[PDB]
Ligand binder design. Structure first.
Ligand SMILES: *[C@@H]1O[C@H](CO)[C@@H](O[C@@H]2O[C@H](CO)[C@@H](O[C@@H]3O[C@H](CO[C@H]4O[C@H](CO[C@H]5O[C@H](CO)[C@@H](O)[C@H](O)[C@@H]5O)[C@@H](O)[C@H](O[C@H]5O[C@H](CO)[C@@H](O)[C@H](O)[C@@H]5O)[C@@H]4O)[C@@H](O)[C@H](O[C@H]4O[C@H](CO)[C@@H](O)[C@H](O)[C@@H]4O[C@H]4O[C@H](CO)[C@@H](O)[C@H](O)[C@@H]4O[C@H]4O[C@H](CO)[C@@H](O)[C@H](O)[C@@H]4O)[C@@H]3O)[C@H](O)[C@H]2NC(C)=O)[C@H](O)[C@H]1NC(C)=O
Ligand SMILES: *[C@@H]1O[C@H](CO)[C@@H](O[C@@H]2O[C@H](CO)[C@@H](O[C@@H]3O[C@H](CO[C@H]4O[C@H](CO[C@H]5O[C@H](CO)[C@@H](O)[C@H](O)[C@@H]5O)[C@@H](O)[C@H](O[C@H]5O[C@H](CO)[C@@H](O)[C@H](O)[C@@H]5O)[C@@H]4O)[C@@H](O)[C@H](O[C@H]4O[C@H](CO)[C@@H](O)[C@H](O)[C@@H]4O[C@H]4O[C@H](CO)[C@@H](O)[C@H](O)[C@@H]4O[C@H]4O[C@H](CO)[C@@H](O)[C@H](O)[C@@H]4O)[C@@H]3O)[C@H](O)[C@H]2NC(C)=O)[C@H](O)[C@H]1NC(C)=O
Ligand SMILES: *[C@@H]1O[C@H](CO)[C@@H](O[C@@H]2O[C@H](CO)[C@@H](O[C@@H]3O[C@H](CO[C@H]4O[C@H](CO[C@H]5O[C@H](CO)[C@@H](O)[C@H](O)[C@@H]5O)[C@@H](O)[C@H](O[C@H]5O[C@H](CO)[C@@H](O)[C@H](O)[C@@H]5O)[C@@H]4O)[C@@H](O)[C@H](O[C@H]4O[C@H](CO)[C@@H](O)[C@H](O)[C@@H]4O[C@H]4O[C@H](CO)[C@@H](O)[C@H](O)[C@@H]4O[C@H]4O[C@H](CO)[C@@H](O)[C@H](O)[C@@H]4O)[C@@H]3O)[C@H](O)[C@H]2NC(C)=O)[C@H](O)[C@H]1NC(C)=O
Ligand SMILES: *[C@@H]1O[C@H](CO)[C@@H](O[C@@H]2O[C@H](CO)[C@@H](O[C@@H]3O[C@H](CO[C@H]4O[C@H](CO[C@H]5O[C@H](CO)[C@@H](O)[C@H](O)[C@@H]5O)[C@@H](O)[C@H](O[C@H]5O[C@H](CO)[C@@H](O)[C@H](O)[C@@H]5O)[C@@H]4O)[C@@H](O)[C@H](O[C@H]4O[C@H](CO)[C@@H](O)[C@H](O)[C@@H]4O[C@H]4O[C@H](CO)[C@@H](O)[C@H](O)[C@@H]4O[C@H]4O[C@H](CO)[C@@H](O)[C@H](O)[C@@H]4O)[C@@H]3O)[C@H](O)[C@H]2NC(C)=O)[C@H](O)[C@H]1NC(C)=O
Ligand SMILES: CC(=O)N[C@H]1[C@H]([C@H](O)[C@H](O)CO)O[C@@](O)(C(=O)O)C[C@@H]1O
Ligand SMILES: CC(=O)N[C@H]1[C@H]([C@H](O)[C@H](O)CO)O[C@@](O)(C(=O)O)C[C@@H]1O
Ligand SMILES: CC(=O)N[C@H]1[C@H]([C@H](O)[C@H](O)CO)O[C@@](O)(C(=O)O)C[C@@H]1O
Ligand SMILES: [Ca+2]
Ligand SMILES: [Ca+2]
Ligand SMILES: [Ca+2]
Ligand SMILES: [Ca+2]
Ligand SMILES: [Ca+2]
Lengths: 388, 388, 388, 388
């Protein structure tokens, strides 16, 4: 109808309730489920769906061997009905590639997929299911994007890309698209030293992205975008409650404008909702691997370098595998505020479970509740032994 | 369009004709059919569909092992086209959880799923396929609901929940929802001593629920709800024709305001249509197990403590497995009256058939006819031996 | 929109072109295809679909054993997209039963399914996907119907049923339905001595049905219905070109008002288009079994007891299995005339191919062309050996 | 709505970006994927889909044995969602046959399928999913058509057919259809000596077809059609950059009005976009077999007999199998010009990979970009060894 505008503030987050879960690996043990990774969730005005990068093979298929690799010509961004598994028969291909983002602007959806060799990748921006714009690699080193939904405001949908090193300074750009066409792009500015896989959400005409400093930071970089002025700023979450992985143990004081050191050249896509006292951080429980997942209420995490948790909720036990996590909200729901939501990628197989030759995942997602709900843990649920 | 109002009375029930049957277990022996239990049927203004709690695995899948358990993180309320089996590819997830109800109010559908550990479960109320309200456990002992459709009148959709003991007094509540929001809730009142899994239907602005007294009663408790005043009453079906299972043999006089004793701490979800002389009761044939199924015309069963059958119809032979049964009607059909319908869950596998490691079911359903139709029996139809 | 009226005459039939073919048995050798029999084709104003009586099991499934039997509680009328195979995932259940008919009246579709034991069957008439009317068996001996589409005119959709003996006089009735309700019914009248499985079509406000005299006739009985007056007549196709199976060899003179003798208590559903010189008859090539299939132009077959063929077209070689055949037309196509169409059921498995334990079929269908098209033969195409 | 008119010119082709890829063979190793060949892509005003000639069997199915053959009664034109594989459950049958074309005129789609024995084939023209016209073979020698989309302008959709010899002069005809009816047909005229499998596109009220001279030419014949005057001309691409396969090595001077000799009685469906300096040619890399695939910018190829490449893009490495290739464009996209697109059929199995008994393919397709994008190669990706 009309372009959606971020007119509401976030609802108060007092706990998280179960939103969706596809049990993909369990089901796929005996049904035609596509091998995936890098999933996320995104809503249209009339439906919310699961998204992920298929590996172009089923889990039981012989071609599942080798799916630990991230980039091949057989990957594609696919979407499917909320909480269903990504099957060969119900998956809809949005575009071809090994890195992506997607978001609905209120009128129609924009999907972006990047493909190519490491030194010659290119992004193609789709709008209303048609290719509209193409952007060639600018640093010739794995042009890559969010791996979770972008956000729009009055037709303008900003997207964060990075091209260049994963272990040193790189060239990050914020592109402002409208109807799949480039209105403008800026180089990253601010104090964030390295940006990758931004998880974003919007509220009151502002877009907040919590990203991954793969190079040096165990605290997460944050990019705040003004989609009207088409400008942005960057910093890190000040809080000592560190949320990347692997990471050192939490200190008593964090860092607001530099990566918190201790772990180099590695990380995991993650997210947060930064909203004063209504601030919640997601992170793996393990400081060593993508194991477990929890949400922590850390009032003023973004700006308070001594902020510590005041409440929490375990999502996945540290005795279960987790993975990527990102933000999304249903901007078309009823009510006076936007309900914060997130998903956690539950990776199965390689490298942690090497008895199988494949790597895939399933999805679990939650949304906030103003109630103080009882908690449960939500593991993938599949038995590797069954696949042997 | 507009909210549906229960303006009609029930059609005269002279017999039951076949409405739907999915042959899920038969078909699933060699196709991707999800393991389920606790099924039901519910209509939208333009379509009637099958519903059930998936176990998040196919029947032939290795994860079918252990599906005798009722509550896990892999269950979800799913719906699928009338008389099709619940397959991985045609099942639509309504919400995540291990106990549910769902009903269309004329404008859109409300679905409710409860999930959690036994001592910390929570219900999330979905409306128009979005989460709207959440209710935390109040007795910290398996918050649970109907396992069959709720009923609406002018936007108000009452739902019966129970939290606490399955073998002693518990805390039952009647919630009155409108557009997924709570208008009001009451504690159970009346003479029903224990309430579980209410089967409901509506006629002439009144909602009647036939439930399960798991603690002491072999006769069934009944809750009558006024969805306008948002009040209710409770009692038991007076009739000596006992309809829970297991149960003692039928006496000559029943009980109107106390559980009829003889069997404790067990039962099965069931239903009835209480409409004066146009009264029909469903029950398993066996007094020992979920075996067989029959419909009995017992004029004035609700209020006559000596009422006995005047007509009947066998649905499932006592040489075949049955299970849960509940009520539903198509409130959007043509005509001057509501046609009473019901489904019977035909459980296969554990515990009665232990040669297989799984537990699932198929569905059979009937609706009333004003004709006096010839009868047939409707078994699940699968051969366990084939799954060995 | 408005009820369709049979306002056009048939197009001139100069040959038959290929319309649809699903290759169900071939495909089903390695995919989830339902075992069926008694298929047909029927059109809605916006789509034409395949129909058949499922056996409630896939062909490769272990439950395919025994599917040679005609009536069980696991059968159902299902429809699916034109030329697709009837799979577990794309088949839509119209109703439950082991005998059926279905037709669209221009506004919505009426489907009828009969189920029950042999001595207590009942038909339930569905309209707009809801059960509306039920008819109990009147002769307590396998109440049965067309097994192909019915035809409507101004809302009135006549349907031919038979109850009683398959090897002696039976009770055939013509029911005139409108919106699923019975307007009127008549007993069969005229000279047809036994009626079963009528294949019907309509043109210029008249409905013509070519049926099966199972008891004595090798020539086919014909019922002509006036859907406005709601009256009918019956006779046999006069022509010596005999079209039932098994049958004696063709004589030089046929019979107009009595069954042509030679073969008792057996037959096969078949059809014809009786339109003066524009008359075509379908029949199996073999006089012994459901083998081969051909179309023969026999000018004035209905009324000329010496009529012989003037043109022909082989549909299935006598070295391939055939089966049932029936009529349908797309009453919603463009143009000034109705294009005659028909389907042939290609039965595979039992009894003719006993190396497999199942019985199923695939479908081939053609429609007329005013051109004189070259011919091809259209076999099922599956190799039984593959299923062993 | 209204018939589409070719009002735009082509966009400037500076490179090719990835548009769709289904990875059919990879996926089909362990899922119900239909065996196909002769694929293409075609757009409706609201969706773009993949098309191909199914072989009426899955790849893993036993009936895949023998699918190297081109014409059988089990083939059919099917379409399915962009970039999905052609599965038993998501494929839509357009018509029955072993040679086809299809195109949307802006209001609805016309599909054409030819079937029959070699000496008695016939084409049936479908419009709005109904059969409308039939054309009998005129030379009694494999009546055949494009194997890629036709193009329409103001309701008129020209289609090129050929009947007669594949190794000598044949009878090619250009039929001008409107709403599935024949407005007119012409015999081929011009200097093209043999025409087969035309790949066409339209721009500025002109339709250009690049075909296959199977008899003598290694350069490609070209047919330019005026869909308003309903007339055409034919010649060959003048350029020495030869694009059929097998072929001799490129000379320094080509031929404008005669086949370029060196290879007889063989070829492959191919295409080009002839637009002055904005001219691009597709061809296999190998001059011996359907191996590899590349796009070459050859300014004025059509009219310059000495034209050589000025730019290029590899699509498939010469170490990978290719196959047919053809043109299509989304005539309903936004913007001021038509974006040239094409697909390449990646054939797997027989005859080149004889360890398996089947022959199938997958699809890759690209569209032009005004950017100068980095390139990647796009192989089928399946491991034959897995199918053994
Ligand atoms: C049914 O469901 C409900 C709902 O879920 C269940 O209740 C939930 O229970 C969970 C688990 O207990 C709670 O989660 C934890 O929350 C605490 C925060 O709450 C405590 O602290 C608050 C703040 O206190 C300080 O400030 C306040 C405010 O000014 C001040 O008042 C106070 O005096 C003090 O100065 C308190 O307000 C709060 O009190 C309230 O609630 C109590 C119950 O929760 C109640 O008893 C009180 O009466 C009062 O009403 C409470 O005391 C989080 O701190 C905690 O997170 C830490 O712990 C988990 C392990 O449990 C760990 O994984 C987290 O990462 C985190 O700890 C790590 O990080 C810290 C920060 O750097 C670090 O300091 C720690 O050492 C630790 O670090 C190590 O681990 C990490 C991760 O591996 C690693 O990276 C580091 O390097 C290092 O190795 C939990 O989130 C929920 O809040 C609670 N929800 C609700 C609504 O109640 C209920 O239990 C269920 N019922 C049943 C029967 O099961
Ligand atoms: C073709 O299809 C048609 C349609 O389906 C088939 O016909 C149907 O046939 C079935 C089976 O026969 C019928 O079902 C039974 O119905 C009877 C009720 O009908 C009888 O009783 C009526 C009431 O009589 C008393 O009151 C009346 C009224 O004031 C008074 O007139 C009379 O004198 C007497 O005082 C009679 O009206 C009725 O008569 C009419 O119909 C006759 C045919 O049905 C006809 O002959 C007559 O001329 C007249 O027209 C008739 O006599 C039910 O009582 C019965 O249910 C009991 O039996 C089944 C086993 O069959 C059992 O499973 C049930 O649970 C129940 O019995 C248990 O519960 C009782 C109550 O507590 C208890 O007393 C019993 O001891 C027994 O208890 C034990 O078992 C249970 C369960 O395991 C356990 O929990 C207990 O602890 C204990 O162990 C059937 O429902 C249909 O009504 C009938 N339908 C129609 C339309 O006719 C036809 O047969 C088919 N054709 C063919 C060829 O197959
Ligand atoms: C490319 O495609 C085209 C299009 O399909 C192919 O051409 C088609 O070819 C087929 C096969 O040949 C034709 O089918 C047969 O048609 C004949 C009818 O046509 C003949 O007879 C006409 C009528 O003649 C009498 O009346 C006329 C009219 O007044 C009068 O003129 C004439 O003198 C005579 O008095 C002739 O008009 C007609 O002539 C025209 O066409 C000729 C070509 O067809 C051409 O040469 C002529 O110049 C002229 O232009 C022609 O002579 C059917 O009779 C025949 O059906 C019988 O035969 C098949 C076996 O072939 C059998 O299965 C049928 O059941 C039937 O025979 C049984 O039933 C009879 C009736 O009771 C009985 O008498 C027979 O003994 C036999 O009975 C036995 O078998 C049955 C079944 O098993 C059993 O039940 C009995 O008990 C008993 O055992 C075919 O249908 C098409 O018409 C023709 N189509 C067209 C448009 O041309 C072309 O061949 C293909 N090209 C290639 C290269 O392959
Ligand atoms: C990241 O991505 C980018 C984007 O894809 C990658 O860059 C691309 O790189 C590829 C591969 O190198 C390029 O493809 C080739 O393009 C050349 C054409 O370009 C050259 O020639 C131009 C024309 O020159 C003449 O005319 C001009 C104009 O008047 C005049 O200026 C000039 O002096 C001369 O007189 C030059 O303009 C052009 O220069 C520009 O670009 C250069 C880089 O490309 C740059 O260095 C310059 O500074 C300048 O900016 C350039 O020199 C094609 O000719 C070539 O195709 C031939 O070669 C391939 C094998 O590579 C072969 O398969 C083709 O079939 C073809 O060769 C066959 O056919 C010929 C014609 O008959 C024949 O002559 C050959 O002998 C050969 O024939 C044999 O093989 C065939 C097939 O098997 C067989 O049938 C025959 O019988 C026989 O056996 C390629 O298409 C892209 O253009 C380029 N794209 C862009 C935008 O730059 C980049 O590399 C990637 N980065 C990384 C790090 O990997
Ligand atoms: C485009 C791409 O290759 N993305 C990959 C990124 C990058 O390697 C890192 O961000 C370093 O830049 O991380 C992953 O490997 C990971 O950690 O699981 C997965 C993902 O596929
Ligand atoms: C929420 C829940 O666990 N419900 C379960 C109930 C309760 O156990 C009983 O009502 C006692 O409260 O009964 C079942 O076990 C049963 O009898 O088959 C199935 C169902 O899943
Ligand atoms: C309702 C029913 O049983 N119909 C069956 C009929 C009847 O047996 C005959 O018409 C005799 O009445 O014929 C079949 O067996 C047959 O010949 O293949 C199939 C069909 O299922
Ligand atoms: Ca399978
Ligand atoms: Ca890091
Ligand atoms: Ca009880
Ligand atoms: Ca007969
Ligand atoms: Ca050639």
């Amino acid at each position: 109808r009309d372009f959606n505008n971020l007119t509401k503030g976030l609802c108060t987050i007092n706990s998280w309730h179960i939103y969706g879960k596809d049990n993909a690996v369990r089901i796929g043990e005996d049904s035609d489920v596509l091998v995936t990774r890098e999933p996320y969730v995104s809503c249209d005005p009339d439906e919310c769906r699961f998204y992920a990068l298929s590996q172009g093979t089923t889990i039981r298929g012989k071609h599942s061997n080798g799916t630990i690799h991230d980039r091949s010509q057989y990957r594609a961004l696919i979407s499917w009905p909320l909480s269903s598994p990504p099957t060969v028969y119900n998956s809809r291909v949005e575009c071809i590639g090994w890195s992506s983002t997607s978001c609905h602007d209120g009128k129609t959806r924009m999907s972006i997929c990047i493909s190519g060799p490491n030194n010659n990748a290119s992004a193609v921006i789709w709008y209303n299911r048609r290719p509209v714009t193409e952007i060639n690699t600018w640093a010739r080193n794995i042009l890559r994007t969010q791996e979770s939904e972008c956000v729009c405001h009055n037709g303008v949908c900003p997207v964060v890309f990075t091209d260049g090193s994963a272990t040193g300074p790189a060239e990050t750009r914020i592109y402002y698209f409208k109807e799949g066409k480039i209105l403008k792009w800026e180089p990253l500015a601010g104090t964030a030293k390295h940006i990758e896989e931004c998880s974003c959400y919007g509220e009151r005409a502002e877009i907040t992205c919590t990203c991954r400093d793969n190079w040096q930071g165990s605290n997460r970089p944050v990019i705040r975008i003004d989609p009207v002025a088409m400008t942005h700023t960057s910093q890190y979450i000040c809080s000592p409650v560190l949320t990347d992985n692997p990471r050192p143990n939490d200190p008593t004081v964090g860092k607001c404008n530099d990566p918190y050191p201790g772990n180099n050249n590695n990380g995991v896509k993650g997210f947060s909702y930064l909203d004063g006292v209504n601030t919640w951080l997601g992170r793996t429980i393990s400081i060593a691997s993508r194991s477990g997942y929890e949400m922590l209420k850390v009032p003023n995490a973004l700006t308070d370098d001594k902020s510590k948790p005041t409440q929490g909720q375990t999502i996945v036990l540290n005795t279960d595998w987790s993975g990527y996590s990102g933000s999304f909200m249903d901007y078309w729901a009823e009510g006076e505020c936007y309900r914060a939501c997130f998903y956690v990628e539950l990776i199965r197989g390689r490298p942690k479970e090497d008895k199988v030759w494949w790597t895939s995942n399933s999805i679990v997602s939650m949304c906030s509740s103003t109630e103080f709900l009882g908690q449960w843990d939500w593991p993938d649920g599949a038995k590797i032994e069954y696949f042997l």
